[PDB]
Every structure is written in structure tokens, then in C-alpha cells.
Design an enzyme around this catalytic site. Structure first.
Site, short mmCIF file in Angstrom:
data_model
loop_
_atom_site.label_atom_id
_atom_site.label_comp_id
_atom_site.label_asym_id
_atom_site.label_seq_id
_atom_site.Cartn_x
_atom_site.Cartn_y
_atom_site.Cartn_z
N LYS A 47 4.81 -7.15 4.75
CA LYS A 47 4.62 -8.12 6.06
C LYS A 47 3.05 -8.23 6.31
O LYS A 47 2.94 -9.22 6.76
CB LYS A 47 5.15 -7.56 7.35
CG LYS A 47 4.26 -7.03 8.22
CD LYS A 47 4.15 -5.44 8.22
CE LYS A 47 4.65 -4.66 9.56
NZ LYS A 47 3.31 -4.32 10.08
N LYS A 96 15.58 8.41 9.81
CA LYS A 96 15.82 8.81 8.51
C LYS A 96 17.06 9.64 8.32
O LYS A 96 17.60 9.51 7.32
CB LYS A 96 14.55 9.59 8.02
CG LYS A 96 13.33 9.04 7.99
CD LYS A 96 13.17 7.86 7.14
CE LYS A 96 11.93 7.23 7.09
NZ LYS A 96 11.94 6.39 5.92
N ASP A 116 8.91 -9.90 6.21
CA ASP A 116 9.00 -8.95 7.22
C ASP A 116 10.35 -8.51 7.18
O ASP A 116 11.43 -9.34 7.50
CB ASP A 116 8.65 -9.35 8.68
CG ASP A 116 8.75 -8.38 9.88
OD1 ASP A 116 9.49 -7.26 9.76
OD2 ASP A 116 7.87 -8.44 10.69
N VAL A 117 10.66 -7.21 6.94
CA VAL A 117 12.11 -6.95 6.60
C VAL A 117 13.11 -6.86 8.04
O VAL A 117 14.18 -6.71 7.81
CB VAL A 117 12.52 -5.39 5.90
CG1 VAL A 117 11.26 -5.42 4.72
CG2 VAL A 117 12.03 -4.22 7.05
N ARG A 168 0.87 -1.27 0.02
CA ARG A 168 -0.10 -0.11 0.06
C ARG A 168 0.95 1.17 -0.02
O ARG A 168 2.05 1.32 0.16
CB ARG A 168 -0.74 0.00 1.24
CG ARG A 168 -0.35 0.30 2.28
CD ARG A 168 -1.10 0.18 3.62
NE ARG A 168 -0.48 1.14 4.85
CZ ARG A 168 -1.22 1.52 5.86
NH1 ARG A 168 -2.20 0.81 6.26
NH2 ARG A 168 -0.68 2.06 6.79
N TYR A 177 11.81 8.90 15.19
CA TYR A 177 11.54 8.80 13.57
C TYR A 177 12.72 9.65 12.45
O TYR A 177 13.04 9.15 11.52
CB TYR A 177 10.22 8.95 13.17
CG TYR A 177 10.02 8.88 11.66
CD1 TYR A 177 9.36 8.08 11.07
CD2 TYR A 177 10.14 10.16 10.97
CE1 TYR A 177 9.27 7.92 9.83
CE2 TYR A 177 9.80 10.17 9.70
CZ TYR A 177 9.29 9.22 8.88
OH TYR A 177 9.32 9.15 7.58
N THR A 206 -1.12 9.11 2.01
CA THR A 206 -1.00 7.52 2.07
C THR A 206 -1.83 7.01 3.35
O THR A 206 -2.34 8.05 4.11
CB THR A 206 0.59 7.25 2.48
OG1 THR A 206 0.96 7.40 3.75
CG2 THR A 206 1.48 7.55 1.43
N1 LIG Z 1 4.38 11.65 4.06
C1 LIG Z 1 4.77 10.34 4.04
O1 LIG Z 1 4.06 9.52 4.09
C2 LIG Z 1 6.18 10.00 4.01
C3 LIG Z 1 7.11 10.95 3.86
C4 LIG Z 1 8.56 10.62 4.09
C5 LIG Z 1 8.93 9.45 4.01
N2 LIG Z 1 7.94 8.52 3.94
C6 LIG Z 1 8.37 6.94 3.92
O2 LIG Z 1 7.75 6.36 2.89
C7 LIG Z 1 7.62 5.01 3.31
C8 LIG Z 1 6.23 4.52 3.06
O3 LIG Z 1 5.27 5.19 4.01
P1 LIG Z 1 3.89 5.43 3.67
O4 LIG Z 1 3.33 6.51 4.07
O5 LIG Z 1 3.76 4.49 2.49
O6 LIG Z 1 3.46 4.11 4.94
P2 LIG Z 1 2.40 2.96 4.74
O7 LIG Z 1 2.06 2.77 6.13
O8 LIG Z 1 0.99 3.44 3.86
O9 LIG Z 1 2.88 1.81 4.01
C9 LIG Z 1 4.06 1.15 4.58
C10 LIG Z 1 4.02 -0.24 4.14
O10 LIG Z 1 5.20 -1.07 4.54
C11 LIG Z 1 4.73 -2.31 5.15
N3 LIG Z 1 5.79 -2.49 6.13
C12 LIG Z 1 5.66 -2.04 7.58
N4 LIG Z 1 6.42 -2.67 8.25
C13 LIG Z 1 7.03 -3.76 7.46
C14 LIG Z 1 8.08 -4.70 7.73
N5 LIG Z 1 8.67 -4.79 8.94
N6 LIG Z 1 8.38 -5.55 6.42
C15 LIG Z 1 7.68 -5.50 5.50
N7 LIG Z 1 6.80 -4.36 5.40
C16 LIG Z 1 6.51 -3.53 6.18
C17 LIG Z 1 3.52 -2.04 5.76
O11 LIG Z 1 2.50 -3.11 5.82
C18 LIG Z 1 2.80 -1.02 4.50
O12 LIG Z 1 2.03 -2.16 3.47
C19 LIG Z 1 8.41 4.80 4.75
O13 LIG Z 1 9.92 4.56 4.80
C20 LIG Z 1 8.03 6.51 5.30
O14 LIG Z 1 8.80 6.75 6.43
C21 LIG Z 1 6.54 8.45 3.96
O1 LIG Z 2 2.65 11.00 7.92
N1 LIG Z 2 3.82 10.33 7.95
O2 LIG Z 2 3.79 9.39 8.15
C1 LIG Z 2 5.02 11.58 7.41
C2 LIG Z 2 4.72 12.79 7.01
C3 LIG Z 2 5.64 13.53 6.60
C4 LIG Z 2 6.95 12.92 6.55
F1 LIG Z 2 7.98 13.79 6.16
C5 LIG Z 2 7.28 11.77 6.81
O3 LIG Z 2 8.49 11.20 6.75
C6 LIG Z 2 6.29 10.90 7.38
#
Ligand SMILES: NC(=O)c1ccc[n+]([C@@H]2O[C@H](COP(=O)([O-])OP(=O)(O)OC[C@H]3O[C@@H](n4cnc5c(N)ncnc54)[C@H](O)[C@@H]3O)[C@@H](O)[C@H]2O)c1
Ligand SMILES: O=[N+]([O-])c1ccc(F)c(O)c1
Ligand SMILES: NC(=O)c1ccc[n+]([C@@H]2O[C@H](COP(=O)([O-])OP(=O)(O)OC[C@H]3O[C@@H](n4cnc5c(N)ncnc54)[C@H](O)[C@@H]3O)[C@@H](O)[C@H]2O)c1
Ligand SMILES: NC(=O)c1ccc[n+]([C@@H]2O[C@H](COP(=O)([O-])OP(=O)(O)OC[C@H]3O[C@@H](n4cnc5c(N)ncnc54)[C@H](O)[C@@H]3O)[C@@H](O)[C@H]2O)c1
Ligand SMILES: NC(=O)c1ccc[n+]([C@@H]2O[C@H](COP(=O)([O-])OP(=O)(O)OC[C@H]3O[C@@H](n4cnc5c(N)ncnc54)[C@H](O)[C@@H]3O)[C@@H](O)[C@H]2O)c1
Ligand SMILES: O=[N+]([O-])c1ccc(F)c(O)c1
Ligand SMILES: O=[N+]([O-])c1ccc(F)c(O)c1
Ligand SMILES: O=[N+]([O-])c1ccc(F)c(O)c1
Ligand code: NA
Ligand code: NA
Ligand code: NA
Ligand code: NA
EC number: 1.1.1.122
Lengths: 252, 252, 252, 252
Positions: free
Chosen positions: A37, A154, A58-59, A15, A150, A185
Site C-alpha cells: 500500500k 495471528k 491496500d489489502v 520492505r 495482535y 525489520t
Molecule cells: N519480528 C517480526 O517483525 C515479525 C514476527 C512475526 C510475524 N511478523 C509478520 O511479518 C509480516 C511482515 O512484518 P514486518 O516486520 O516485515 O513489517 P514491516 O512493517 O517492515 O513491513 C510490512 C509491509 O506491509 C505493508 N502493508 C501494511 N499494511 C498493508 C495493507 N493494508 N495493504 C498492503 N500492504 C500493507 C507495509 O507498507 C510494509 O511494506 C507481518 O504480517 C508481521 O505481523 C513479523
Molecule cells: O516487532 N514485531 O512486530 C514483532 C516481533 C515479534 C513477533 F513475534 C511479532 O509477531 C512481531
């Protein structure tokens, strides 16, 4: 066909951003191994996308990662790109509310999980002159309120990406990261739902960018396909996909 | 077809990085207006590439720029992307060898030329939700020996790119820059020829990158097409195309 | 007298950079608690410096840290500055030679040790409007060859410093870090001794800076006293003490 | 006595940040030459401060700068530090409201004025192993709305500072810059008075920092004295004096 004949592993691909990255690479002609996972999203994605298949992994479990790589090679015969997207953002926590235990657990997912897959995959990426793409965050570079653990995870990802790019450049393996900002997301939506006023939190999230909206997983996907297929003189870079949140003065 | 139906102006497009950018955008389906103050390269390119045409224009002459934009609109009916690549790197000069006069002249080309075309083009880019791509340099961010004026010009370009991205984000116009490192171009080759040992200078230039080679104009072209066609949540960014020269310790 | 009446805890203060920081703060009029997990250096320092005392404390042992803070308050009645300098750089290790176990151990010292003391000290720093100074590294921002785990630990430190500065700014507690480059310390000397040609390694280390020498612990000490006593509009910053190693092109 | 026996030239020293820098250096034991193109502030300062004297000098007039340096040497016999603080921020201007003429004029003051004094002073700074400190701005690194020309001028200053630090490091001359954020000065106050709601503009300016207030010229002065007297392993750095405005998410 920009990445035809190539084999891509995306973690956390069931997702959110990962699902956007999976779709981007399939649309570019690659075959994609969805690692996640949770079964729910990834298995649906595999049914939906010819060229994508789903492997539960599961990573944070090394043997899962070991099996993920060996299954990818056994089924597809090569590995060209690893996208370390699996990660989690805890709910807002004041510094004194954090613990060294929760910190370590977050480090296991956000940092060590990325490290382990990269390590196990690099021998195959060397044979293919492949590349590694870590999904980091803008808040590793600029910080964020109520997210010490967090942000720290990063920070390490972005730095590790540069150190790995140095070590692997003699072997033709490029290593880059994407730093997204606010991307809409299920995780962003879950965190908003825990706010007193969810719609206020989301509206605040949109305005934190000069472009006035949050980003889409598909736009992170496009950045990832670019790094893999067209950025051969790029290594150790941090590609900002943030709508400009880091620019200019704001209300702090 | 990633940028089909779009109209692109590339300055300094007759050779070098600009020529690589021109070719990248034509290969993506855009029509390209090659701007250059020398006839030789650009006119050959226009004969070679269906979809590219050449207009003589010195970016330091405002009326030339005015005519460049009006000719583009009159011939093609829209303007989607402006690539400000025209620029020059003087030969190595110690600080005391520079002058305020040469400094201003360099500012006219590297900074004010970019500013003028951007200004005249923004009304049309607003109508098309287009975008601006400045070609800056890695040495604007990290400095370079014997290049005070040149480094200063690129420092202003990168910063101006972020300021413009702020002003134009409410109007849907994205503004980004590319910071190339060592790219093998006629300019790099000309500068090498003025060194006592040209082949030593070139070999030193390749090793300044962990990847062990210099970059190609085509790789800057790919980065530029990405910023225009697929980076819609990117504004104010500095895309590093450097082979990793900024990473790690070296001999200084 | 720039920091007279103030009480400072320096971890890893028995030798090297920490010892330089201890001396800098004593020379500024503060009383300093030297924390270190080895007795040898710190106890000598305490005999040498009126105003400095030594408390044995392993920053990876939470109860040691708990006792360190309570002893500081009980003996001195206030706490104004915490310098998280305790840390270690492993010998050069290729990526495939690293392990997830060694990585975690390094994270315990370089990152979690800093986190724990900061957490336990912040209640007292809030009462005194004190400040936190983390000793990070230039290679967290730019990477380093054969040091993936170490680089990652310093990436997290620099980022965590910015996140903590956000959380603590409403309470008047400033949080900054220093990123040293090559500093001649027993650790730098120990690592050199493991090189085939130690004097070649040291000579290479000096030339990695434009200034042509490595830095001294006393120069990191001066930067630390500045952040504590005179930098009241500075929070979340990364003070570079590197002799310019990050500037310009080099041999990579 | 941290900078006793030393001779310092501060441009734009008659009010605002420069006046704070003048006072900081006098308090450190240096003799200070106040350069300013207006008589009012600087002459009062010279009457007020034993050790500071005032020389009228417009930094955009080369002969004024030539005379400034020769008067400093003739009266004081040495030159150790040059602080290039003279500069101006125009009122808010949309991109289309700017002109290439106003841009050049701003470049003359903010960039070329700094370049000229530095050039004329470097021969004396080499003899004294002195140092150069440019006052740049945070918005050179992160941009600002409605300030394309101003942002560009500060982008060039920060970059030029790194290029000069490279060229001058073999000669023992360190070159650094300070990037202040919101500092309460007559200029900040003048700009606020042109806003529809001046007190709203000022209150917005305070909140743009996590620390919740603007900075004081005295705090920029302390940073400048640190760079001159105690930062001998620092060259090419950008010292952020911003109260943390660049950290974290805000309203853009
Ligand atoms: N604004 C944001 O959402 C945002 C901003 C910056 C960075 N990120 C990064 O982007 C990445 C994805 O975030 P997202 O918003 O899509 O989140 P999300 O929660 O919608 O999806 C993350 C996915 O990773 C899977 N996952 C979690 N733990 C796991 C594990 N141990 N092993 C395998 N799979 C695992 C979950 O099941 C899920 O499908 C993350 O690294 C997050 O920190 C997100
Ligand atoms: O909603 N979040 O998980 C999220 C929002 C902003 C970010 F820059 C981030 O790393 C994660
Ligand atoms: N390693 C590198 O070569 C490198 C690295 C970083 C940045 N850059 C930048 O890339 C851009 C292109 O550099 P290059 O190496 O391709 O150089 P180049 O000399 O090979 O080509 C530059 C082109 O611009 C044209 N041009 C010059 N002045 C002009 C003017 N006033 N009006 C119109 N056209 C003009 C020239 O005729 C030429 O065709 C420049 O902005 C340069 O600073 C180059
Ligand atoms: N060039 C450099 O040496 C350099 C550059 C950048 C950053 N740094 C950082 O500076 C800091 C000091 O490095 P150094 O060169 O002075 O090293 P060092 O080895 O000379 O001294 C480190 C000190 O910390 C102590 N220490 C180690 N582990 C500890 C623990 N668990 N609990 C308490 N004390 C502990 C050691 O006993 C020693 O006295 C480290 O964080 C290091 O990463 C050093
Ligand atoms: N928040 C801020 O005010 C802020 C933030 C970042 C950077 N800066 C920079 O700090 C510096 C000082 O700004 P300030 O707020 O103190 O402004 P200010 O207007 O209060 O004072 C500037 C001084 O410079 C003098 N000056 C102007 N043009 C000159 C010239 N041609 N020759 C000689 N002297 C000249 C003026 O007479 C005045 O005394 C500038 O470079 C400015 O860009 C200020
Ligand atoms: O050769 N050049 O003109 C050149 C080389 C490297 C750079 F980073 C640059 O901006 C220009
Ligand atoms: O020798 N060291 O331990 C060392 C050298 C250089 C660095 F930047 C560093 O963080 C550590
Ligand atoms: O008010 N000013 O002139 C001002 C405010 C903030 C800045 F960062 C700056 O460079 C200038
Ligand atoms: Na499928
Ligand atoms: Na044609
Ligand atoms: Na003592
Ligand atoms: Na006087």
C-alpha cells in the site's frame, strides 16, 4: 530454477519480511508481483529486480485486491503462489488501553486482508495446483505481553490456515503458514525507537532466542520458497522461524 | 549446489526414507556417507550415486558408531550434517502384548542409536557449524493405536531434539527433527503385508491424509535438505511432513 | 462449597454448554449470573436454580455488557469468574461460499464479545483475584472442514487467552480457556438436522472420538469449576475436553 | 467425597509432588496406597493419614510392582486410579557429560517404571473403569538446558500417554498426564543446593513463571483429583500445571 515459470504474489512486499520473500522467489526463478500500500519500497524493488513488478494494493480494500488478482493474470497468465505477509504490529498496549475499534481495524489488516486475497486467488491456484503461504507469528501460539489484539489476529491466521488446508486439499491446493519470531525489520526497528532505551530493547530482542540473534527477512524468504517449491506433502503446517524462542525456560 | 562442499551422514540410508534423504543430499551437491546395518541397499546406492559411499554400521553398537564417524572424517575431512533416520516400527501390538524387554530394544534403536551418533559427531559439527536432523514421527505428538513402545520412542526423539537445540545453540549447532506421517516405504509395505487385507490397509493409509495419498521418501529428503542448507534461524523445530493427517476430525 | 461466596457470570448460559457451566457453578456453591440474548432458557434456569439469576444481555452490544457488569456488582457486591461461552457455529460453508461480512459478524460474537466482557470485568476481577475462562474449541488448534470463519474465531480466542494471561499475571488474575470437542448441545442437534441424514451425521460425530461418544455440557462445567476453584498455578492453558478426538490417525 | 469408595496408588508418594497427590486424594475420600522406594516419608504419611497406607516398592523392580498391585487388591478389593509420579531429575549435565548408561538408568525410572505399573494395573482398572495419570513435565514439550536424558524421558511419557489412551479408550480406561513446571519440592531444593548460589537459582526459578512463584505439590494434587473424578470426557490430555512458563518471550 526451483520455482521457474511460476507466478507469485507477495503482499506487504515493499520492505521487511515481504521484501525478503520477494527476493527469495525472484532468486528461485519465479516472477513476483509485489503488492504494497506504500509506493516507496515496492517501486524501488521493481526497478531493482528483473522478474519482480509492483502493483499498488491496500489489502483491506476489496476492489484493490480484485484488481491485484486480475492484473496478475492479465500480465502473467497464471498464479501459483500467494504470500499473505501484509500485516502490522501496534506499539505495546496494556489490555485496558485497547479498544474494540482498534481491535477490528487490526483484524481487517492482519486477518481479513489475508482472507480476501486468498479467496479471490483460489480459483486460479486450483487451476495451477498452486499454494497459499500465510505469514503468522510465534506469538499466536505462545502469546506476548501487551499485544492482545495482535496476538488474537495471528491466532486466527494460524487456525484459518489449517481449516483452509482441509477444504482445499481435495483440489490439490496446499495451504501453510510461517510463524516467525523476532525478525529484524523496519517494523521491529520502529517499535524499538518508541522504547525509552531503544538499544536495550533491541539487545533484549536478540537474547530472547537461544541462537542469540534475531532472524533475517531472507531466512523467512527461504522458508517460503521451500513451502512453495519442495513441500508438496506439507499442508496446514506452521513452519517456525524463531531461532528457538519457544524452547526452554526464560525470564517472564 | 545448495549444500556443495558439505559432508552428510545418513543412518538407515540403504532403503526407504533414508535412501530418499541420501538422494536428496547428493542432488544438492553434498557428499553422503550411507550408514546402514544391512549391506544390500546401501552398497547398491553407493555404486549408483557418485558422491555417496556406504559404511556398514549398526547404530546400536557404539564401536560401530565410533568407527562410522572416524571413517567419515578420515575419508572426507569434515562433517556438516547428521541425519538420524535409522529406526524401526514393530507390528501392531496391544498394550498387554508388549514387554519391558521389547520396549528397551526399541529404545536402543529409535532413541539411543540417535543419541550415540549425535554425541560422537557433535565435536566435528561444532567445528563446521553443522547441524543435526532427527527423523521422528507424527505419532510421537498425537499417538497411534497399538504402538505404545514405538510412540514412546518418538516422543523422546522430538523432546530430545529440543533439549539438544538448547544446549548446542551457543555453539552454532542447530538441532531439528522431521515428523513424517504415512510415507510409502518398504517398512510400510512390510507392515501392510501382515494385515489380513493388505490392500485395504494401504488404502486406509492413503485416506488418513487430507491430500489423499501417502508421502514419498523424496519429500522427506527435500525437507531434510531445507533444514540443513536454508534454515539457519530454525533450531529445535519439528517439521511436519504428513499430508495433513493431524488436521481435523476423523474416524477414531 | 468449592466456590462458595463467589460470583460467576456465564454468557450464553441459557442452554447447551453454558447451561451446563451454570449448573456446575451453582452446585459448587457460587452465585451465578446467567447472561443470554434469548429469554427462554435463561429465565427458566433462574426459576429452577436458587443462586442463579438471569440478565438479558447480547454480548455484541457494548452497553448490554456494561449493564451486565454493573448489575452483577450492584446485586452481588463482587465478581470472581467470567465464563465467555456465548458463541455460534454457522452451518457448513465451503470457502468460496463465505463472505467478509459474515466473517466479521462471527468475529463480533465469538471473539469481540468475549473481549468486551473480559475488559469491563477485569477491574473487578483484579480486586477479587478472580479469573477468566474462555470457551474456545478443539478446531481452533486442529482445523475443521467447511468452517474457515468459525475456526479463525476460535484460533483468536485461544491465542488471546494466552496473551491476556501474560498481561494479567502480575495482578493475580488467571486467564484460561477450555477447548471442547464434540459436545451434544442444541447447536450440535440443530446443525445435524440440516444434514441430509441427521442420524448419520450424529453417529459420525460420536465416532470422531476414541471414547465413542460425544461430551456433555456437565463435563465442560466440571472443567470450568476446576479452572476457577482449584487451578491456581494454571494460567494461559487450553484445557482439552474432547474425548480424544485430536489423537491418532483417522479418515480425513 | 468426590472420589469416595475409590482406591488409588501413587508412586513416589513419600515426599514432594507425590505426597501432595496422596494428600489430595485422601482429602477427596479415596483410600490411597503410597508406593515409594524410601521408607522415611511414606511411613510417616501413613501414620498421619487415615485412609493412606504405605507399601515399599521400587518401580524399577518388576516383582516389587507385581507385589504392589497384588497387595493393593488383596487389602482393598479394587483399583481405580494409578498415579505414576515416581521419577528423578539428574543434576545439570552438558550433552558431552551424559552417557548411554546413565540415559538407560533414567529411562528405567522415568519411563519403564511408569510402563510396568500401568501394565500390571490395567486389568483391574478395566474392571473398575478406572484411569491412569502420568506425571510428566513441561520440559518434555519445550525442552530444557543441560537435561537431554531427562527431557527425553518426559517426551516419551507424554507421547506414551496418548498412545495408551487410544488403546484403552474402547475399554473405558482413560489415560492422561500432568505436565508440571517449576514445583517447589525436595528435589527442586536439592538441585538448588548444588548451585554456586542456591538462593539465586531459586529466585531465578520463581521468575521463570509469569505468576512469579513456583507451584505447590498440592496444586498438582488438585489437578490429579480432577483428572480422576471429574474429567470423564478427557483422555490422552496433557494438563499443564506451570504458572504459565511456556507463554511469551523470555531470556534464553
Ligand atoms: N519480528 C517480526 O517483525 C515479525 C514476527 C512475526 C510475524 N511478523 C509478520 O511479518 C509480516 C511482515 O512484518 P514486518 O516486520 O516485515 O513489517 P514491516 O512493517 O517492515 O513491513 C510490512 C509491509 O506491509 C505493508 N502493508 C501494511 N499494511 C498493508 C495493507 N493494508 N495493504 C498492503 N500492504 C500493507 C507495509 O507498507 C510494509 O511494506 C507481518 O504480517 C508481521 O505481523 C513479523
Ligand atoms: O516487532 N514485531 O512486530 C514483532 C516481533 C515479534 C513477533 F513475534 C511479532 O509477531 C512481531
Ligand atoms: N510412514 C513411515 O514409514 C514413517 C513415518 C514416520 C517416521 N518414520 C521413521 O522414518 C525412519 C525410516 O523409516 P522407513 O519407513 O524408511 O523404514 P525402512 O524399514 O524402510 O528403512 C530403515 C532403514 O534403517 C536400517 N536400520 C534399521 N535398524 C538399524 C540399525 N540398528 N543400524 C543401522 N541401520 C538400521 C534398515 O536396514 C533400513 O535400511 C524411521 O526412524 C521411522 O520410524 C517412518
Ligand atoms: N460441540 C460443541 O457444541 C462445541 C465444541 C467446541 C466449542 N463449542 C463452543 O461452546 C459454546 C457454546 O456452544 P453450544 O454448543 O452450547 O451452543 P448453543 O447454541 O446450544 O448455546 C449458545 C448460547 O449462547 C447464546 N448466545 C448466542 N449469541 C449470543 C450473544 N450475542 N449474546 C449472548 N448470548 C448469546 C444463545 O442464546 C445460547 O443460549 C460456543 O462458544 C461454541 O463455539 C461448542
Ligand atoms: N518442578 C518439579 O519438581 C517437577 C516438574 C515437572 C515434573 N516433575 C516430576 O514430578 C515427579 C515428582 O518429582 P518431585 O519434585 O516430587 O521429586 P522428589 O524427589 O521430591 O520425590 C520423588 C519421590 O519418588 C521416589 N522415588 C524415586 N525413585 C523411585 C523408584 N525407583 N521407585 C519408587 N519411588 C521412587 C522418591 O523416594 C521420592 O519420594 C517426578 O516424575 C518429576 O520428574 C517435577
Ligand atoms: O509404517 N510405519 O512404520 C509408520 C507409519 C506411520 C508413522 F507415523 C510411523 O511413524 C511409522
Ligand atoms: O456443533 N458444533 O457447533 C461444534 C462441533 C464441534 C466443535 F469442535 C465446535 O467448535 C462446534
Ligand atoms: O527441579 N526439577 O526436578 C524440575 C524442575 C522443572 C521441571 F520442569 C522438571 O521436570 C523438573
Ligand atoms: Na523488474
Ligand atoms: Na558412489
Ligand atoms: Na434463582
Ligand atoms: Na493411615
Amino acid at each position: 530454477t526451483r520455482y521457474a515459470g511460476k507466478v507469485v504474489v507477495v503482499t506487504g512486499g515493499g520492505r521487511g519480511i515481504g521484501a525478503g520473500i520477494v527476493r527469495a522467489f525472484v532468486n528461485s526463478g519465479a516472477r513476483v508481483v509485489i503488492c504494497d500500500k506504500d509506493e516507496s519500497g515496492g517501486r524501488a524493488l521493481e526497478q531493482e529486480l528483473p522478474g519482480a513488478v509492483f502493483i499498488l494494493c491496500d489489502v483491506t480494500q476489496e476492489d484493490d485486491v480484485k484488481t491485484l488478482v486480475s492484473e496478475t493474470i492479465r500480465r502473467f497468465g497464471r498464479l501459483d503462489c500467494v504470500v499473505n505477509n501484509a500485516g502490522h504490529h501496534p506499539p505495546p498496549q496494556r489490555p485496558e488501553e485497547t479498544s474494540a475499534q482498534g481491535f477490528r481495524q487490526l483484524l481487517e489488516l492482519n486477518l481479513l486482508g489475508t482472507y480476501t486475497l486468498t479467496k479471490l486467488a483460489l480459483p486460479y491456484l486450483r487451476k495451477s495446483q498452486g499454494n497459499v503461504i500465510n505469514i503468522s507469528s510465534l506469538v499466536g501460539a505462545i502469546g506476548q505481553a501487551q499485544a492482545v489484539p495482535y496476538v488474537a489476529t495471528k491466532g486466527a491466521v494460524t487456525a484459518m490456515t489449517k481449516a483452509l488446508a482441509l477444504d482445499e486439499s481435495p483440489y490439490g491446493v496446499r495451504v501453510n503458514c510461517i510463524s516467525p519470531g523476532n525478525i529484524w525489520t523496519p517494523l521491529w526497528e520502529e517499535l524499538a525507537a518508541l522504547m525509552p532505551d531503544p538499544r536495550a530493547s533491541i539487545r533484549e530482542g536478540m537474547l530472547a532466542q537461544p541462537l542469540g540473534r534475531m532472524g533475517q527477512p531472507a531466512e523467512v524468504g527461504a522458508a517460503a520458497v521451500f513451502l512453495a517449491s519442495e513441500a508438496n506433502f506439507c499442508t496446514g503446517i506452521e513452519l517456525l522461524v524463531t531461532g528457538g524462542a519457544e524452547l526452554g525456560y526464560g525470564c517472564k
